[PDB]
Write a protein that binds this ligand. Structure first.
Ligand code: X8Z
Ligand code: ZN
Ligand code: ZN
Length: 231
């Protein structure tokens, strides 16, 4: 069910949702896949996360221009690493309004990232303050607590079965939590649980570095976060 387009891969998840996948091409490591989302909200398109690079991200825009051919209203990027924010310059050159967690925008420079144009803020219960996320359509944005990073945010897609965990969640068969250099190892477990609780009906869990999975990815991630906390 995948379709290669250039160095990119696209996979339809529902009538109006597609997974985009890009691969890091650096002379020192293997072809590391990153997943993001494309959502057709009626007469416009919404993007969750860039690709690794500007060119890869423009390649995303081209696939959208070709296969959907509606204007891209906005993008939301889900934390200040390269696999999520590596392509901001491309989104800006294309006139696309960009959003990130305020904390993500604050960390951007230290991380080598260009900041998003607009900053999301969040209630104590983790739900986005609606005024900071205007006209987000079916995108339901939830900050689950520090985990994979301090800033990681998550997105549910109204009207579908899908919730996007970003790099916070790994699939049910993953061996480890991956690079934990930026990780809050104390809150990770609770933050994964908070994600699953925020989207309790979502049956397809989409993540950054595994194929879509069921809810078992959430509990599996939480357990692995608990095992690590206990050492
Ligand atoms: C550079 C990316 C940002 S999330 C990363 O840390 N990754 C990509 C896949 C897993 C993990 C790793 O390198 O160990
Ligand atoms: Zn990351
Ligand atoms: Zn990642």
């Amino acid at each position: 069910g995948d379709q290669r387009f250039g160095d990119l891969v696209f996979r339809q998840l529902a009538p109006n949702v597609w997974q985009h996948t890009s691969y890091l091409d650096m002379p020192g490591f293997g072809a590391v896949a990153s997943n993001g989302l494309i959502v057709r909200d009626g007469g416009r398109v919404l993007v969750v996360d860039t690709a690794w690079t500007d060119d890869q991200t423009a390649q995303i825009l081209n696939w959208i221009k070709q296969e959907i051919n509606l204007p891209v209203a906005l993008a939301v990027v889900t934390h200040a690493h390269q696999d999520k924010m590596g392509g901001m310059d491309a989104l800006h050159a294309a006139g696309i309004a960009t959003y990130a967690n305020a904390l993500s925008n604050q960390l951007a420079p230290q991380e080598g990232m260009v900041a998003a144009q607009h900053s999301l803020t969040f209630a104590a219960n983790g739900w986005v303050e609606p005024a900071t996320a205007p006209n987000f359509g079916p995108l339901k944005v939830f900050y689950p607590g520090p985990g994979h990073t301090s800033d990681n945010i998550t997105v549910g897609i109204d009207g579908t079965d899908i919730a996007f965990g970003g790099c916070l969640i790994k699939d049910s068969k993953a061996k480890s939590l991956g690079n934990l250099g930026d990780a809050d190892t104390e809150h990770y477990a609770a933050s994964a649980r908070a994600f699953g609780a925020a989207f309790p009906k979502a049956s397809m869990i989409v993540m950054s570095h595994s194929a879509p999975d069921s809810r078992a990815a959430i509990t599996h991630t939480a357990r692995m976060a608990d095992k690590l906390r206990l050492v």
